[PDB]
Amino acid sequence: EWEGTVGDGL
Amino acid sequence: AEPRRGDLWLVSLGGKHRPAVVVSVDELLTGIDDELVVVVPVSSSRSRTPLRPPVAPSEGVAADSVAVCRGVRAVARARLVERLGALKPATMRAIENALTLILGLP
Amino acid sequence: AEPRRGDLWLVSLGGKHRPAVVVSVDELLTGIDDELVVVVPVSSSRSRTPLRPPVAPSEGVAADSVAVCRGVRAVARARLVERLGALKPATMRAIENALTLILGLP
Protein backbone atom coordinates (compact mmCIF):
# COMPACT_ATOMS: atom_id res chain seq x y z
CA GLU A 1 0.00 0.00 0.00
CA TRP A 2 2.64 2.44 1.21
CA GLU A 3 5.20 0.00 -0.23
CA GLY A 4 6.03 2.17 -3.25
CA THR A 5 7.46 4.84 -0.94
CA VAL A 6 10.13 2.47 0.46
CA GLY A 7 12.81 3.80 -1.91
CA ASP A 8 12.26 7.57 -1.54
CA GLY A 9 15.37 9.74 -1.18
CA LEU A 10 17.65 6.70 -1.58
CA ALA B 1 1.41 26.11 1.52
CA GLU B 2 4.32 23.91 2.48
CA PRO B 3 3.70 20.93 4.80
CA ARG B 4 3.92 21.83 8.47
CA ARG B 5 4.39 19.57 11.48
CA GLY B 6 0.98 18.63 12.81
CA ASP B 7 -0.63 19.04 9.36
CA LEU B 8 -2.70 16.26 7.83
CA TRP B 9 -1.78 15.90 4.13
CA LEU B 10 -2.91 13.68 1.28
CA VAL B 11 0.05 11.59 0.09
CA SER B 12 0.45 10.13 -3.41
CA LEU B 13 1.54 6.50 -3.06
CA GLY B 14 2.31 5.75 -6.73
CA GLY B 15 -1.77 5.34 -7.80
CA LYS B 16 -3.67 5.64 -4.53
CA HIS B 17 -3.73 8.61 -2.18
CA ARG B 18 -3.93 8.38 1.58
CA PRO B 19 -3.75 10.87 4.46
CA ALA B 20 -0.74 11.13 6.75
CA VAL B 21 0.40 13.42 9.59
CA VAL B 22 3.58 15.45 9.14
CA VAL B 23 5.78 14.69 12.14
CA SER B 24 9.22 15.99 11.13
CA VAL B 25 10.06 19.52 12.33
CA ASP B 26 9.44 22.63 10.26
CA GLU B 27 13.07 23.79 10.45
CA LEU B 28 14.17 20.93 8.15
CA LEU B 29 12.22 22.14 5.09
CA THR B 30 14.32 23.86 2.41
CA GLY B 31 11.47 23.96 -0.13
CA ILE B 32 12.78 21.55 -2.77
CA ASP B 33 10.58 18.81 -4.26
CA ASP B 34 12.99 15.93 -3.50
CA GLU B 35 13.49 16.56 0.23
CA LEU B 36 12.27 13.97 2.69
CA VAL B 37 9.32 14.71 4.99
CA VAL B 38 8.62 12.29 7.84
CA VAL B 39 4.93 11.36 7.96
CA VAL B 40 2.73 8.97 9.95
CA PRO B 41 0.11 7.23 7.76
CA VAL B 42 -3.52 7.67 8.81
CA SER B 43 -6.00 4.86 8.21
CA SER B 44 -9.79 4.73 8.46
CA SER B 45 -9.71 0.92 8.46
CA ARG B 46 -7.54 0.00 11.46
CA SER B 47 -8.70 -0.23 15.07
CA ARG B 48 -7.44 2.23 17.66
CA THR B 49 -4.66 1.14 20.02
CA PRO B 50 -2.11 3.04 22.13
CA LEU B 51 0.23 3.02 19.13
CA ARG B 52 -2.64 3.97 16.78
CA PRO B 53 -4.22 7.02 18.45
CA PRO B 54 -7.49 8.22 16.90
CA VAL B 55 -7.83 11.07 14.41
CA ALA B 56 -11.19 12.92 14.07
CA PRO B 57 -12.81 14.48 10.96
CA SER B 58 -12.24 17.91 12.55
CA GLU B 59 -8.53 17.18 12.01
CA GLY B 60 -8.99 16.67 8.26
CA VAL B 61 -9.97 13.04 7.64
CA ALA B 62 -13.34 12.12 6.13
CA ALA B 63 -14.12 9.36 8.66
CA ASP B 64 -12.91 8.33 12.14
CA SER B 65 -9.30 7.27 11.63
CA VAL B 66 -6.10 6.26 13.46
CA ALA B 67 -2.47 7.37 13.08
CA VAL B 68 -0.35 4.26 12.33
CA CYS B 69 2.79 5.38 14.17
CA ARG B 70 4.54 2.08 13.53
CA GLY B 71 4.25 2.94 9.81
CA VAL B 72 6.25 6.19 10.21
CA ARG B 73 8.08 6.90 6.94
CA ALA B 74 10.17 9.56 5.29
CA VAL B 75 8.71 10.30 1.84
CA ALA B 76 9.56 12.75 -0.91
CA ARG B 77 7.91 16.14 -0.44
CA ALA B 78 6.55 15.87 -3.99
CA ARG B 79 4.23 13.08 -2.79
CA LEU B 80 2.42 15.54 -0.48
CA VAL B 81 -0.20 16.81 -2.90
CA GLU B 82 -2.86 18.48 -0.74
CA ARG B 83 -3.23 19.77 2.81
CA LEU B 84 -6.31 18.25 4.46
CA GLY B 85 -6.28 19.83 7.90
CA ALA B 86 -4.44 20.00 11.20
CA LEU B 87 -4.37 17.85 14.33
CA LYS B 88 -5.39 18.84 17.84
CA PRO B 89 -2.46 19.29 20.28
CA ALA B 90 -3.63 16.24 22.25
CA THR B 91 -3.59 14.09 19.10
CA MET B 92 -0.02 15.22 18.40
CA ARG B 93 0.99 14.39 21.98
CA ALA B 94 -0.47 10.89 21.65
CA ILE B 95 1.46 10.48 18.39
CA GLU B 96 4.67 11.72 20.01
CA ASN B 97 4.15 9.23 22.84
CA ALA B 98 3.57 6.34 20.44
CA LEU B 99 6.71 7.29 18.47
CA THR B 100 8.71 7.60 21.69
CA LEU B 101 7.68 4.04 22.60
CA ILE B 102 8.22 2.55 19.14
CA LEU B 103 11.72 4.00 18.80
CA GLY B 104 12.81 3.40 22.42
CA LEU B 105 13.61 7.05 23.13
CA PRO B 106 13.79 8.91 26.51
CA ALA C 1 11.54 -12.06 14.32
CA GLU C 2 15.33 -11.92 14.58
CA PRO C 3 16.34 -8.30 13.76
CA ARG C 4 17.16 -6.48 16.98
CA ARG C 5 17.35 -2.78 17.73
CA GLY C 6 20.88 -1.61 17.07
CA ASP C 7 21.46 -4.23 14.36
CA LEU C 8 22.77 -3.40 10.90
CA TRP C 9 20.71 -5.28 8.31
CA LEU C 10 20.78 -5.19 4.52
CA VAL C 11 17.43 -3.87 3.25
CA SER C 12 16.01 -4.80 -0.18
CA LEU C 13 14.34 -1.68 -1.60
CA GLY C 14 12.91 -3.01 -4.88
CA GLY C 15 16.46 -4.02 -7.26
CA LYS C 16 18.50 -1.78 -4.96
CA HIS C 17 19.82 -2.55 -1.48
CA ARG C 18 21.14 -0.49 1.40
CA PRO C 19 22.35 -1.17 4.93
CA ALA C 20 20.14 0.24 7.65
CA VAL C 21 20.03 0.45 11.44
CA VAL C 22 17.07 -1.13 13.23
CA VAL C 23 15.61 1.56 15.51
CA SER C 24 12.20 0.16 16.56
CA VAL C 25 12.05 -1.76 19.88
CA ASP C 26 12.38 -5.53 20.14
CA GLU C 27 9.03 -6.03 21.95
CA LEU C 28 7.14 -5.03 18.79
CA LEU C 29 8.37 -8.14 16.97
CA THR C 30 5.68 -10.80 16.74
CA GLY C 31 7.52 -13.03 14.24
CA ILE C 32 5.40 -12.40 11.14
CA ASP C 33 7.22 -11.53 7.92
CA ASP C 34 4.98 -8.61 6.92
CA GLU C 35 5.18 -6.78 10.25
CA LEU C 36 6.84 -3.39 10.17
CA VAL C 37 10.36 -2.72 11.46
CA VAL C 38 11.57 0.90 11.64
CA VAL C 39 15.05 1.44 10.17
CA VAL C 40 17.47 4.28 9.47
CA PRO C 41 19.19 3.87 6.06
CA VAL C 42 22.97 4.05 5.90
CA SER C 43 24.69 6.01 3.11
CA SER C 44 28.29 6.01 1.89
CA SER C 45 27.71 8.90 -0.55
CA ARG C 46 26.65 11.70 1.83
CA SER C 47 28.75 13.80 4.20
CA ARG C 48 28.44 13.54 7.96
CA THR C 49 26.29 16.14 9.73
CA PRO C 50 24.71 16.29 13.19
CA LEU C 51 21.67 14.56 11.63
CA ARG C 52 23.86 12.08 9.67
CA PRO C 53 26.21 10.62 12.29
CA PRO C 54 29.01 8.30 11.14
CA VAL C 55 28.87 4.52 11.31
CA ALA C 56 32.19 2.69 11.66
CA PRO C 57 33.25 -0.31 9.54
CA SER C 58 33.57 -2.06 12.90
CA GLU C 59 29.76 -1.84 12.94
CA GLY C 60 29.46 -3.69 9.58
CA VAL C 61 29.40 -1.02 6.81
CA ALA C 62 31.75 0.63 4.32
CA ALA C 63 34.14 3.42 5.18
CA ASP C 64 32.72 6.93 5.58
CA SER C 65 29.14 5.78 5.94
CA VAL C 66 26.52 7.80 7.80
CA ALA C 67 23.10 7.01 9.31
CA VAL C 68 20.57 9.14 7.38
CA CYS C 69 18.14 9.61 10.25
CA ARG C 70 15.96 11.95 8.21
CA GLY C 71 15.29 8.92 5.96
CA VAL C 72 13.84 6.86 8.86
CA ARG C 73 11.16 4.49 7.54
CA ALA C 74 9.12 1.47 8.48
CA VAL C 75 9.66 -1.49 6.17
CA ALA C 76 8.32 -5.04 6.12
CA ARG C 77 10.53 -7.44 8.06
CA ALA C 78 10.82 -9.53 4.89
CA ARG C 79 12.80 -6.69 3.31
CA LEU C 80 15.62 -7.23 5.87
CA VAL C 81 17.52 -9.88 3.93
CA GLU C 82 20.90 -10.17 5.67
CA ARG C 83 22.25 -9.35 9.12
CA LEU C 84 25.38 -7.24 8.68
CA GLY C 85 26.37 -6.30 12.21
CA ALA C 86 25.59 -4.14 15.23
CA LEU C 87 26.20 -0.53 16.25
CA LYS C 88 28.38 0.65 19.10
CA PRO C 89 26.20 2.12 21.89
CA ALA C 90 27.50 5.69 21.30
CA THR C 91 26.44 5.51 17.64
CA MET C 92 23.00 4.42 18.80
CA ARG C 93 22.88 7.43 21.11
CA ALA C 94 23.86 9.79 18.27
CA ILE C 95 21.05 8.30 16.17
CA GLU C 96 18.53 8.56 19.01
CA ASN C 97 19.44 12.23 19.46
CA ALA C 98 19.08 12.92 15.72
CA LEU C 99 15.67 11.18 15.65
CA THR C 100 14.51 13.11 18.73
CA LEU C 101 15.43 16.34 16.94
CA ILE C 102 13.92 15.34 13.58
CA LEU C 103 10.60 14.28 15.10
CA GLY C 104 10.23 17.10 17.64
CA LEU C 105 10.10 14.82 20.63
CA PRO C 106 10.53 16.27 24.21
Numbering used by the authors:
A (entry chain Q): 67 to 76
B (entry chain A), C (entry chain B): 2 to 15, 23 to 114
What are the paper's exact sentences on this?
Toxin-antitoxin (TA) systems in prokaryotes are modules composed of a toxin and an antitoxin. All the MazF members are RNases, responsible for the cleavage of all types of RNAs participating in translation. Consequently, the activation of MazF RNases often leads to the inhibition of the translation process, reduction in metabolic rates, and eventually the formation of “persister cells”. Here, we report cocrystal structures of M. tb MazF-mt1 and -mt9, two important MazF members responsible for specific mRNA and tRNA cleavages, respectively, in complexes with truncated forms of their cognate antitoxin peptides.
The interactions with the MazF-mt9 toxin are mostly concentrated in the last helix of MazE-mt9 (α4), with the residue Asp74 conferring a dominant impact to the mutual binding. We synthesized the α4-peptide (Asp63–Gly77) and measured its affinity to the toxin by ITC. As expected, α4 bound to MazF-mt9 with a high affinity, and the kd value was 87 nM, comparable to that of the full-length MazE-mt9 (kd = 25 nM). At a molar ratio of 10:1, the α4-helix completely abolished the cleavage activity of the MazF-mt9 enzyme toward tRNALys(UUU). To reveal the interaction details between the pair, we obtained the structure of MazF-mt9 bound with the 15-residue α4-peptide. The peptide binds in the interfacial groove of the MazF-mt9 dimer and forms a heterotrimeric structure, but the first four residues and the last residue were disordered. The rest of the structure assumes an overall helical conformation, and it retains most interactions observed in the full-length protein. In addition, the bulky Trp68 allows the helix to insert into the active site and makes hydrophobic contacts. Interestingly, the peptide appeared to bind to the interface symmetrically with the isosteric residues Thr71Val72 acting as the central residues, which are located exactly in the middle of the resolved peptide (we only observed ten residues). We found that the removal of the first four residues and the last residue (E9-α4 (10-residue)) from the peptide made a remarkable difference, as evidenced by its inability to inhibit the toxin, although these residues were disordered in the complex structure.
